[PDB]
Design a protein around this ligand. Structure first.
Ligand code: HEM
Ligand code: HEM
Ligand code: HEM
Ligand code: HEM
Lengths: 141, 146, 141, 146
């Protein structure tokens, strides 16, 4: 359950990302592919090397989804419903992998927002990404 | 799966710059704040009621320092993490009954703390190398469960 | 997300447990303590040996909570709110442990309801216990 | 953590009664039904659209039989599960990229299938012994990740 403080913290941390949102999303993907090679198999039509325009383009879409989550943090299941269907039904993404990407998103934020990434804000972000991950894995059937 | 020479270099260069009196406690503190059930193992540590209380708690910082030393140890014996971590495994598994999933979480918290503290120096390849390390340590520490 | 079929399946499987509910709850606890010794540490005021009146009494309370979940399957967060507070705030139960008890509940149902435990009903029950576990771990702060 | 003589007895007595042409496929089938993302690894297996389709799919039953044989193998070499499972570990980890969490799930599914099929004979001590086994197998199969 996201507290009011969590919502505030997440809104504030994300607000500082500004025009870098797409870039940080791509960065998190890259960190995930390198640190957790099993996740690479989901992107055979992607070249996953550094500076990949595909990873870049994809990072923008990931970020847009997170932004959508932040903006509708009280209505996330509804907000990300299409995405949950996609990830469970078409993509069949292993739920363990959401924890891996969530970790890499946290690492990316930490590396870019030294002032914002306090222990409290760290906890809010973790809960936020876990709630997103929950929604995105809620549609297996 | 262990480290290439290039990863070992990246890892040791960065680790040399780590303040060993602070980083351990920062990681342990954050574990207690981010995954609050872990506080169950620290009822004698006194005040853990707020993020500030936890991070500035002297028992947390002291224990943190010991944790970081074990990682340092680990770094020095990547080829025998099992032997290095045997006594710690007996402690945490046989005596404490810590679920080994928590070893993975602490390792990841430490990775987040390194990213926070080195920023852009903590590149994706550098993190990749560190994930191998923390995975290794976690697996070794869990040995008494296997 | 629990489908209508899931809700039907869970209602039907549970309905067959009848007067055995308390007993099966105790049985699941016992299976958990034996198979997963780390969980024993949460009950130092309990003797956990076979035929323990404490485990028996406790099995009844666990079952009552599940029954409450079944009866209010569309409103589970609200229905188990007190319990979620208890498990996160007072008890500080590790979330991994809910998966262990959920598994042992499934094993207990399987061992007692051979006709009911089809693959489909097995899947509904798993999703049900995971949703319960989600609610019970939703209150860490 | 391995088996007492009493656990080995319980485990072998029950396992002797297992139909080796059915139980493997029952377990694999249930994995695919209960944890549907696992179906991603079986796109060539044809119809998996309903629980009935999955359970009666001949490729599922055939592969299931092979899985059960590996468990049987495991049972025969509890003291060297790593060597026993080396080639399977290379396959599932290096070639297939199956997340090792799925090895734990399949083992637990197999436990549920044993409970279903032996009922009250599948006592809590008997399950305790079997959990050690499936944990062992999972850990060995994951070795290429460690
Ligand atoms: C917070 C977690 C995640 C978010 C917010 C997210 C978001 C998205 C978005 C917005 C898309 C594009 C959908 C569209 O264009 O209609 C997408 C596609 C995709 N996602 Fe994710 N995703 C997440 C986690 C994951 C994970 C963990 C994996 C695998 C490890 C994954 C694998 C994929 C794949 C393979 C595609 C298809 C890309 C393509 O074919 O172009 N996603 N995701
Ligand atoms: C990579 C993971 C971990 C490492 C490397 C590690 C390392 C250590 C070290 C070096 C000590 C000092 C032992 C001594 O005084 O000789 C210790 C003690 C302790 N650890 Fe950890 N630890 C880890 C994870 C955890 C986790 C996740 C928990 C709880 C959730 C935990 C709970 C404790 C407790 C309660 C003690 C106090 C033991 C005592 O003095 O009786 N540890 N650990
Ligand atoms: C579906 C999962 C679970 C359900 C439905 C459940 C339900 C309950 C209920 C109804 C109570 C009694 C509350 C009261 O009397 O006010 C309770 C207490 C308790 N639970 Fe759970 N529980 C679950 C999982 C767990 C797990 C996984 C653990 C630890 C591994 C755990 C540990 C405890 C402990 C230590 C108590 C206190 C018992 C006492 O002191 O008498 N519970 N639970
Ligand atoms: C305890 C866990 C497991 C055991 C003991 C096991 C055992 C086996 C065995 C014996 C084979 C036959 C290999 C051969 O033909 O020589 C096999 C193949 C295969 N397994 Fe598993 N398996 C396990 C878990 C899993 C899981 C969880 C998945 C997917 C989620 C998986 C995916 C596959 C696939 C796709 C093949 C076909 C390989 C091929 O023919 O190319 N396995 N496994």
């Amino acid at each position: 359950v996201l507290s009011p403080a969590d919502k505030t913290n997440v809104k504030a941390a994300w607000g500082k990302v500004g025009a870098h949102a797409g870039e940080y999303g791509a960065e998190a993907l890259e960190r995930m592919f390198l640190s957790f090679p099993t996740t690479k198999t989901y992107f055979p039509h992607f070249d996953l090397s550094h500076g990949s325009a595909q990873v870049k383009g994809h990072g923008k879409k990931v970020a847009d989804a997170l932004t959508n989550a932040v903006a509708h943090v009280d209505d996330m299941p509804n907000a990300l419903s299409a995405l949950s269907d996609l990830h469970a039904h078409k993509l069949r993404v292993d739920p363990v992998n959401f924890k891996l990407l969530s970790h890499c998103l946290l690492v990316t934020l930490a590396a870019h927002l030294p002032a914002e990434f306090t222990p409290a804000v760290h906890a809010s972000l973790d809960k936020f990404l876990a709630s997103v991950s929950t929604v995105l894995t809620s549609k297996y059937r | 799966v262990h480290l290439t020479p290039e990863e070992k270099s990246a890892v040791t260069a960065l680790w040399g710059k780590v303040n060993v009196d602070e980083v351990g406690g920062e990681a342990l503190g954050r574990l207690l704040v981010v995954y609050p059930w872990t506080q169950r193992f620290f009822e004698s540590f006194g005040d853990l009621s707020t993020p500030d209380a936890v991070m500035g708690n002297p028992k947390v910082k002291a224990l943190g320092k010991k944790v970081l030393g074990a990682f340092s140890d680990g770094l020095a014996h990547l080829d025998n993490l099992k032997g290095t971590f045997a006594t710690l495994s007996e402690l945490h598994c046989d005596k404490l009954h810590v679920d080994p999933e928590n070893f993975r979480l602490l390792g990841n918290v430490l990775v987040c703390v390194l990213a926070h503290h080195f920023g852009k120096e903590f590149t994706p390849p550098v993190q990749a190398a560190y994930q191998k390390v923390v995975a290794g340590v976690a697996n070794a520490l869990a040995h008494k469960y296997h």
